[PDB]
Amino acid sequence: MREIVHLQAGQCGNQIGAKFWEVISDEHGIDPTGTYHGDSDLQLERINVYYNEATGGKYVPRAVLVDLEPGTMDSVRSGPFGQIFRPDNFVFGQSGAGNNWAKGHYTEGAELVDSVLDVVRKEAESCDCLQGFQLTHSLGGGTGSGMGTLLISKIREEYPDRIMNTFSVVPSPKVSDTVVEPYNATLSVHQLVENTDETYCIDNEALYDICFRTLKLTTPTYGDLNHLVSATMSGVTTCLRFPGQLNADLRKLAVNMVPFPRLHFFMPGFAPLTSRGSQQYRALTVPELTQQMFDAKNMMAACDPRHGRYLTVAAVFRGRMSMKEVDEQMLNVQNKNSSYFVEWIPNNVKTAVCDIPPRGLKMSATFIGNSTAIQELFKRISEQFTAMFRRKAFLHWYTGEGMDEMEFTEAESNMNDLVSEYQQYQD
Amino acid sequence: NYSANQYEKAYLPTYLQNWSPARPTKEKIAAHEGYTQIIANDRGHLLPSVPRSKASPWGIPPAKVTLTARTTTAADNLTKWIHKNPDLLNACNGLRPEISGKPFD
Amino acid sequence: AKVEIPSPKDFLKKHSKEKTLPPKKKFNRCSPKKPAVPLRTDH
Amino acid sequence: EITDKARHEAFAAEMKHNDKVMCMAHDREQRHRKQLCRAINDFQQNFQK
Amino acid sequence: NPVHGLPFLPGSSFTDSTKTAFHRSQTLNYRNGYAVVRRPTMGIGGD
Amino acid sequence: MRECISIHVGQAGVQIGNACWELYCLEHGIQPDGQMPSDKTIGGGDDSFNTFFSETGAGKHVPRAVFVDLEPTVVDEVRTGTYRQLFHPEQLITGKEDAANNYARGHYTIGKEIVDLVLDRIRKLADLCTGLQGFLIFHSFGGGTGSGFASLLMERLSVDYGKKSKLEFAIYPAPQVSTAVVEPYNSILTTHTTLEHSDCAFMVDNEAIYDICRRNLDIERPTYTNLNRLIGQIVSSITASLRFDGALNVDLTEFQTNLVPYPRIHFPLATYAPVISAEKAYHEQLSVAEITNACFEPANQMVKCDPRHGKYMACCMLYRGDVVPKDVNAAIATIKTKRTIQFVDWCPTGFKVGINYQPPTVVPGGDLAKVQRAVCMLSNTTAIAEAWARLDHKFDLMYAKRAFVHWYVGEGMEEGEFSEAREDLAALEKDYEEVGVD
Amino acid sequence: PFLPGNSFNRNIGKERFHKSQHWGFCNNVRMLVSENKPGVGGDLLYG
Ligand SMILES: Nc1nc2c(ncn2[C@@H]2O[C@H](COP(=O)(O)OP(=O)(O)OP(=O)(O)O)[C@@H](O)[C@H]2O)c(=O)[nH]1
Ligand SMILES: Nc1nc2c(ncn2[C@@H]2O[C@H](COP(=O)(O)OP(=O)(O)OP(=O)(O)O)[C@@H](O)[C@H]2O)c(=O)[nH]1
Known part of the structure; x- marks a missing residue:
């Protein structure tokens, strides 16, 4: 059968996984102790695509936790769901990161890549036939960038036939806290584009605005931000774990989403977000779902595709639907903005329908977007990188590490090439 | 005084808290032949024919730095201001620091 | 075995490490034994 | 099910066997360590007097 | 009696501020040639 | 793990470190004796104090700091203070002769014979510690004993130990107030000696x-x-x-x-x-x-x-x-x-x-x-x-x-x-x- | 039971450890000296 093993890395990857894994435990309905309480057969049947079985009806997750700083793991292990996580899978180092790409990519990874690959391969023959791998980390995360580039470079040669899914978050455009972050991103994305087959693009500022817009709860927890996104990649995996007249294969999705090789970066889209009174003020209907689904304010990933045009679109629908409404809504949006798409491809929409609603709500959906709105993203970092490299600030650290400016030359060169590639295809 | 095999994680400055590297090590030996003659009498006394370490060992401005971008003339002295002190370049725990940097234009 | 630690010497150059190939797939197809259905408006 | 069940009790009986003695074993050494520590500290100051 | 184990929707949750002191327990240490890991017993602040 | 060492050089650097350690014992609830109540926190020295104190099986929270001084005057009453039982006796480095505000006097005349001893204190602190991210150097630019003695030690600790951090803390000279006019002599002497070695x-x-x-x-x-x-x-x-x-x-x-x-x-x-x-x-x-x-x-x-x-x-x-x-x-x-x-x-x-x-x-x-x-x-x-x-x-x-x-x-x-x-x-x-x- | 890893040695308060010589030589042959012998720190024998 076809299964999936997860990779969690970076200190954000530490928090997101716990939130990501607790959702899955709850949505399949296992107690915190780990003894599954049989209530839905379908979640009972298709658990083996992500989880293995331990003794006593205990569902051992198939994921690998890697970090350097113990305290984050201690907080995670002390969470309500660390017990389902294996001390075997807790791999880490004896060093502090310094939040540095160079040490995390060359120095400290040297003595940990061996251990981490051993853990993942042990899981690899433990399972039979994977679809691939999915990775939760940050591009602006120092340790996550460091280890991820190492392992994603490796697992290509051993497994060039699988899905190397990458889940990374873009730091805030207005401020990145870390000042060497533009350097870390430029390095990491350069290897990322060579190694990844898929990349999710998410930025925190939108979630702040989403908290302002529909949440309306002033002061949230960062875990709630994790909670908001934890539903996202869960929804795309609901395709695999749940039945319905929809082809769930990410390959069948990716080939529908990848017209040309360099298109790796994609924008999520989620379904009803509702405020205090509007839960009972909302007539939950496919059109108003469809209306809300395609809202520039409903966007959360990077920025408004209003600045550019639409290359390809894929919305997966979760709940009790029919082929009639999804078809007309597709016609509705098609005629709504026919010119906003690219004349290169007509019928750039691919739809999937999941007949199994989530727990709590009936009508739901998810969307992945590939529009011409990523230029602003890496163009923004272009002025930053060209700025910082004009007098090589903070460069003495990496030179002692062995780094030198020549590597940065092609690092910026390719992203310049990507700008034109994104520019030329649409413009 | 050699480095062990395979289990090369249980013996590191990780537990030593060593801030000056202990000793360079290796795992390789050329296939030695030789009846390994004895070349002394009773006292470590090398027979005059065979050679030894011929009384080689018998018994501050140096600091870690990268040249980075500090005026060439100042940097040039620093190199000399690092070296020319064998009393801190030869033996006795090692006495020997490192260096890095990049030139100017 | 002992894993090489990639030293900070170099990495991928301008991402020339890829597989794009625009060839033409020759060998044609099998034989459609069914001939031309009409005879081009003749007797 | 005989094959199925036989595994289940074979594990769990062994499973309950493992942890509890481990819990008890870890408790025992600490207390004796504590009792030795206090015992050393007592006569010595008595000897110091 | 609030609805416990209510729909754990991604959007909203509950809050509490009665917490005063937050100390965490060291469950990780190295301590001899093998890195050795402790069993978590006390949470943040000790519980 | 996550710990660091504090050093207090100059007769001014000792009273400030005293207050700092006096402050530090409050949040941990440390009694002046050196032990907690009957509550169970003692062990091999691993709890909130493990980064700061060394409370081994003996049960005594031993602060990880060395107070160095050249005059017995100000270093003795603290050894007769309220927490002197906490302090390790030979961690409280005293002297019998002063540097007389002279950098070089402390840096040459007396520095040689005492640094070897404190270097012994450093190494026997170094062996017991585990991760020891850096040092906490408390000094003063107009160091009557701080100036010369801090310089030589930070030279010796830099040359033998260069792979970690060294955190420096000194009172800056008062711009228009000068309790000494030889203060500019050593202060600039300290600065130029420290620029190529000091971390922060x-x-x-x-x-x-x-x-x-x-x-x-x-x-x-x-x-x-x-x-x-x-x-x-x-x-x-x-x-x-x-x-x-x-x-x-x-x-x-x-x-x-x-x-x-x-x-x-x-x-x-x-x-x-x-x-x-x-x-x-x-x-x-x-x-x-x-x-x-x-x-x-x-x-x-x-x-x-x-x-x-x-x-x-x-x-x-x-x-x-x-x-x-x-x-x-x-x-x-x-x-x-x-x-x-x-x-x-x-x-x-x-x-x-x-x-x-x-x-x-x-x-x-x-x-x-x-x-x-x-x-x-x-x-x-x-x-x-x-x-x-x-x-x-x-x-x-x-x-x-x-x-x-x-x-x-x-x-x-x-x-x-x-x-x-x-x-x-x-x-x-x-x-x-x-x-x-x- | 006694399986590997299950052997927890009696490492508790042990103040007396004196050893005897159960065996000896005597005359010109070799044998075990008089049976009545305490063990390590005055330990009784089997029955
Ligand atoms: N876990 C977590 N990460 C956050 C949060 N807010 C922003 N981040 C960012 O998420 C990034 C990813 O974390 P990691 O990849 O583990 O970072 P790292 O390699 O350990 O080093 P740093 O990036 O400097 O933290 C970090 O760089 C943070 O800047 C937050 O609230 N929680
Ligand atoms: N940080 C701090 N500085 C002080 C304090 N009291 C005085 N100072 C200033 O700090 C300087 C300390 O340098 P010194 O006077 O040489 O002190 P010392 O080197 O420890 O020994 P002495 O020469 O005997 O005083 C003095 O010149 C004062 O101006 C204090 O309590 N804390």
């Missing part, structure tokens, strides 16, 4: 410490205890990340990597915003915005530098207490929009946020207010060169008429060393505007 030097000035207190703390009559209370709070706040976690944790390694722009200059400036009397705290409200305005208000800095006369490079804020990401990110965004604030155009971002849940505590018999949200402002600006500019015209006149050299040449130096420091400074000043030039 952090300064402070007593005048503005006094200036603050009768401004808002409203005490026209503070005491050294009050002075030591504020600075001990400063080092407590920065070590709260080691003591407590938060939304994110930061370490001195991040502080070094992210604060210093370029070599040589490694001299940021600390600051603490919620400085206010208890009564003024009582009937007023604290929130992020005003303390963010207060922290960057020019009169709240302990160093006499008009920030408008200079330009900023880095700014580190360490929020200790009950805060949320929403207001702080909005508030700092407004700070970026401000025009009077002038970071260099070179740096787009220069902000390193620290979040810590723990509300900072008051001290019994203290003077501070009761704070829920605190923040520590370690920052570096170009407005500092005036201080050394103040020093050089002070020094250039003095050396031309070469006062007091008869002592210095009298016990074994020459004038070449004094020459070096001036072009060393002339390098630092000339570098300062060059980097100040964009």
Whole structure:
């Protein structure tokens, strides 16, 4: 059968996984102790695509936790769901990161890549036939960038036939806290584009605005931000774990989403977000779902595709639907903005329908977007990188590490090439 | 005084808290032949024919730095201001620091 | 075995490490034994 | 099910066997360590007097 | 009696501020040639 | 694991470290004897104290700091104080002869024979520790015994141990107050010797410490205890990340990597915003915005530098207490929009946020207010060169008429060393505007 | 039971450890000296 093993890395990857894994435990309905309480057969049947079985009806997750700083793991292990996580899978180092790409990519990874690959391969023959791998980390995360580039470079040669899914978050455009972050991103994305087959693009500022817009709860927890996104990649995996007249294969999705090789970066889209009174003020209907689904304010990933045009679109629908409404809504949006798409491809929409609603709500959906709105993203970092490299600030650290400016030359060169590639295809 | 095999994680400055590297090590030996003659009498006394370490060992401005971008003339002295002190370049725990940097234009 | 630690010497150059190939797939197809259905408006 | 069940009790009986003695074993050494520590500290100051 | 184990929707949750002191327990240490890991017993602040 | 070592050189550096350790025993609830109550926290020395104290099976919290001194006077009554039982007897390095304010006297005459001993203390501290991120050096530029003795030790600890961090803390010379006129002699001597070895030097000035207190703390009559209370709070706040976690944790390694722009200059400036009397705290409200305005208000800095006369490079804020990401990110965004604030155009971002849940505590018999949200402002600006500019015209006149050299040449130096420091400074000043030039 | 890892040695308060010589030589042959012998720290024998 076809299964999936997860990779969690970076200190954000530490928090997101716990939130990501607790959702899955709850949505399949296992107690915190780990003894599954049989209530839905379908979640009972298709658990083996992500989880293995331990003794006593205990569902051992198939994921690998890697970090350097113990305290984050201690907080995670002390969470309500660390017990389902294996001390075997807790791999880490004896060093502090310094939040540095160079040490995390060359120095400290040297003595940990061996251990981490051993853990993942042990899981690899433990399972039979994977679809691939999915990775939760940050591009602006120092340790996550460091280890991820190492392992994603490796697992290509051993497994060039699988899905190397990458889940990374873009730091805030207005401020990145870390000042060497533009350097870390430029390095990491350069290897990322060579190694990844898929990349999710998410930025925190939108979630702040989403908290302002529909949440309306002033002061949230960062875990709630994790909670908001934890539903996202869960929804795309609901395709695999749940039945319905929809082809769930990410390959069948990716080939529908990848017209040309360099298109790796994609924008999520989620379904009803509702405020205090509007839960009972909302007539939950496919059109108003469809209306809300395609809202520039409903966007959360990077920025408004209003600045550019639409290359390809894929919305997966979760709940009790029919082929009639999804078809007309597709016609509705098609005629709504026919010119906003690219004349290169007509019928750039691919739809999937999941007949199994989530727990709590009936009508739901998810969307992945590939529009011409990523230029602003890496163009923004272009002025930053060209700025910082004009007098090589903070460069003495990496030179002692062995780094030198020549590597940065092609690092910026390719992203310049990507700008034109994104520019030329649409413009 | 050699480095062990395979289990090369249980013996590191990780537990030593060593801030000056202990000793360079290796795992390789050329296939030695030789009846390994004895070349002394009773006292470590090398027979005059065979050679030894011929009384080689018998018994501050140096600091870690990268040249980075500090005026060439100042940097040039620093190199000399690092070296020319064998009393801190030869033996006795090692006495020997490192260096890095990049030139100017 | 002992894993090489990639030293900070170099990495991928301008991402020339890829597989794009625009060839033409020759060998044609099998034989459609069914001939031309009409005879081009003749007797 | 005989094959199925036989595994289940074979594990769990062994499973309950493992942890509890481990819990008890870890408790025992600490207390004796504590009792030795206090015992050393007592006569010595008595000897110091 | 609030609805416990209510729909754990991604959007909203509950809050509490009665917490005063937050100390965490060291469950990780190295301590001899093998890195050795402790069993978590006390949470943040000790519980 | 996550620990560090404190050193206290100069007879001034010992009373301040005393207060710091006096402060540190409160939050852990340490009794003066050296033991907890019957409650179970003792072991091999692993708990909140493991980073700071060494409470082994003996049950005695042993602080990880060495107090070094050259005169038996001020070091003995502390050995007869209230917590002298806590302190390791031979960790409290005393002497019988002074440096007489002379760098070189401490640096040459007495330094050789005592450093070997303290080096033994260093190594027997080094072996017992595990991760030992760096050192906490408490000194003073006008070190009567601090000047010479700190220099030689930081040379010896640098040369043998160079792979870690070294954190330096000295009182900056008062710009218009000088309790010694040989103070410029050794102070510049200390600076030029330390530039090529010191990792992170952090300064402070007593005048503005006094200036603050009768401004808002409203005490026209503070005491050294009050002075030591504020600075001990400063080092407590920065070590709260080691003591407590938060939304994110930061370490001195991040502080070094992210604060210093370029070599040589490694001299940021600390600051603490919620400085206010208890009564003024009582009937007023604290929130992020005003303390963010207060922290960057020019009169709240302990160093006499008009920030408008200079330009900023880095700014580190360490929020200790009950805060949320929403207001702080909005508030700092407004700070970026401000025009009077002038970071260099070179740096787009220069902000390193620290979040810590723990509300900072008051001290019994203290003077501070009761704070829920605190923040520590370690920052570096170009407005500092005036201080050394103040020093050089002070020094250039003095050396031309070469006062007091008869002592210095009298016990074994020459004038070449004094020459070096001036072009060393002339390098630092000339570098300062060059980097100040964009 | 006694399986590997299950052997927890009696490492508790042990103050007396004196050893005897159960065996000996005598005359010109070799044998075990008089049976009545305490063990390590005065330990009784089997029955
Ligand atoms: N876990 C977590 N990460 C956050 C949060 N807010 C922003 N982040 C960012 O998420 C990034 C990813 O974390 P990691 O990849 O583990 O970072 P790292 O390699 O350990 O080093 P740093 O990036 O400097 O933290 C970090 O760089 C943070 O800047 C938050 O609230 N929680
Ligand atoms: N940080 C701090 N500095 C002080 C304190 N009291 C005085 N100072 C200043 O710090 C300087 C300390 O240098 P020294 O006077 O040489 O002190 P010392 O080197 O330890 O030994 P002495 O020469 O005997 O005083 C003095 O010149 C004072 O101006 C204090 O309590 N704390």
